[model samples]
Target: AHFEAYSLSDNDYDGIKKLLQQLFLKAPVNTAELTDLLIQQNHIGSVIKQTDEDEVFGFISLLNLTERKGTQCVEQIQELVLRFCEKNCEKSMVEQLDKFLNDTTKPVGLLLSERFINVPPQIALPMYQQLQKELAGAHRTNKPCGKCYFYLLISKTFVEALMFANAEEEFFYEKAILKFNYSVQEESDTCLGGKWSFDDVPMTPLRTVMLIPGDKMNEIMDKLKEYLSV
Candidate 1:
């Protein structure tokens, strides 16, 4: 019911290549170069999905559980992810970059990369998205529908997003029925998607609070309070 984490390697070449391919549509760095880099830097690494009980797909070496925030290597990989995202205008991938890339936080674990990684259930996205849409929405509601909401789940229970509705809601929050609060986001188009406000900022991870349902929210909050406060 848990995963085994380890450094990436030559034996994992195919998997690593597969993972990078998923990232760049082609490996941004070829196998030999990748292997060389990994061998050289203990910190620059990718991840493989291995099930303890049993489960294996085309040996797709998914997600890169790379270096920490502010590291050249990690930032380089993150930059690649960003350019790829902006090129495609895909806020989804961009947010994924937000959720995983550099950030003092982010677990260095690629849930189920390759032949997996994860997806499906069209409802859930729009749902969390809509709640974000609803709460982060305005008279010009759903404005950010096509925009983006970079989200993160805390301690696996609470999820929040740094929304990018991309503009002042123009006094919407002041008049809205449900109270909303957020701070200014201004950083990098690369780091934090440049400050998406339904708001985006590492300072305020205003993601959808629906990762945990309402009924259980208070309960979970109490459970993870210190964990959260910390």
Candidate 2:
């Protein structure tokens, strides 16, 4: 959070100590003096110092109860939301899960969906396996599906990464939508089978609107809002 660069000739330790004293109302005056005071008070966490080439960097700190408390509350809220989404949308979640597994923008979808959306693992894993088989067959034939295959691979990697990070099922689905958005933004030259010109086709206003950046988000949102209102 705090950064400083110093020349080798400068008395960096003394300078930092002076700065700390000036910054904090109760600076310990000197390193040795601070160590003795900290030992008596039981207030220090740890001091880490490192030297890279001719430069040295060090940090000294104590944990604040307020930050730790706030972090705990945030984690609790996240867990609650994950549980709520899983319980309420478990049945209807397969559509999104299936799309992510089979779609051309699988990777980006996986990334964004996991963090902001939720899907059950039961739906996600089966579709993902099917994707793998399709990709494997395509690769063996030496005629990969191009961007579609690339998207699938990205999705596959995302799934593996999410699993590695021990993410929940809801997170996976949320990330899938994000991936789809990203994929739509970049125009594809070929269709799913990799032989047709995908760009020759016209996109619906709704579809086009979804891929637009910035204010287009509001446009899409407004369209959805109107639909829901009706």
Candidate 3:
């Protein structure tokens, strides 16, 4: 096997930390503490590691947004989302975010899925599958972590690429209940270029936030499988 999936552990701290920076780019958040939190709640997340070495390719994890609101890192993320959304999202979309993100009665989970910029999208299949299994196990034990009402995901895309592609890419954002994007300039240090670079092309990073019903996760997984298989 080339890459295998494993639960987050102390050994993965350094590897995961580096990946987080790549994922978040210039976002103002403490990735070190976030990495610590992910490792601490090892039961809910997983990391993709090379079988022959200590290299971490990627990771997928869910944080209890409602329950962990008191956490500094969690609070930082919440603020960042709200601030960015208010500045770039439509009024209706911002209201939708408030309904789920601010609700205290029902728990909500923020799903963090990120990997190296050049890693094949296919690797996501296994990591997501493992998260699903772990979530089901947590729910079986009646843990609150598994009972989230909604799942929030943040994805990155390029505006120029979207305009260039005529093919429908529903597999990427179709399942989202509501989504919004915050733009970044091409020359900005925050914007990570795509897997391939053409000197003649301009690239702008789009930070997309997606909200999905917790029950629809499997549906999203199916879409991922279908698209990646092609």
Separate clash counts for every candidate: 7, 18, 0
How close to the true structure is residue 171 of candidate 2, measured as C-alpha lDDT?
A: 31
lDDT (10s digit) by residue, model 2, range 82-146: 33334444545434434433343322111111111122223333323333343355446642231
Tens digit per residue, CA lDDT, model 3, 1-230? 57777889999999889877865788888889899998998999788876538888778788888878788878888888888899987677778777888786667788877776556656666667788888999889866678787887776666653531112123546767687777744442323666654444456656677787777777778876776664
Candidate achieving higher lDDT, 1 or 3? 3
lDDT tens digits, residues 45-72, model 1? 3343445333322221112333334545
TM-score of each: 0.28, 0.18, 0.84
- Candidate 3 TM-score, C-alpha based: 0.84
Ranking by lDDT: 3, 1, 2
Q: Pick the TM-score winner.
A: 3
Report the Cα RMSD per candidate. Answer: 18.1, 24.9, 5.7
lDDT of each: 0.33, 0.28, 0.74
Model 2 vs. true fold: TM: 0.18
Clashing pairs in 3: none
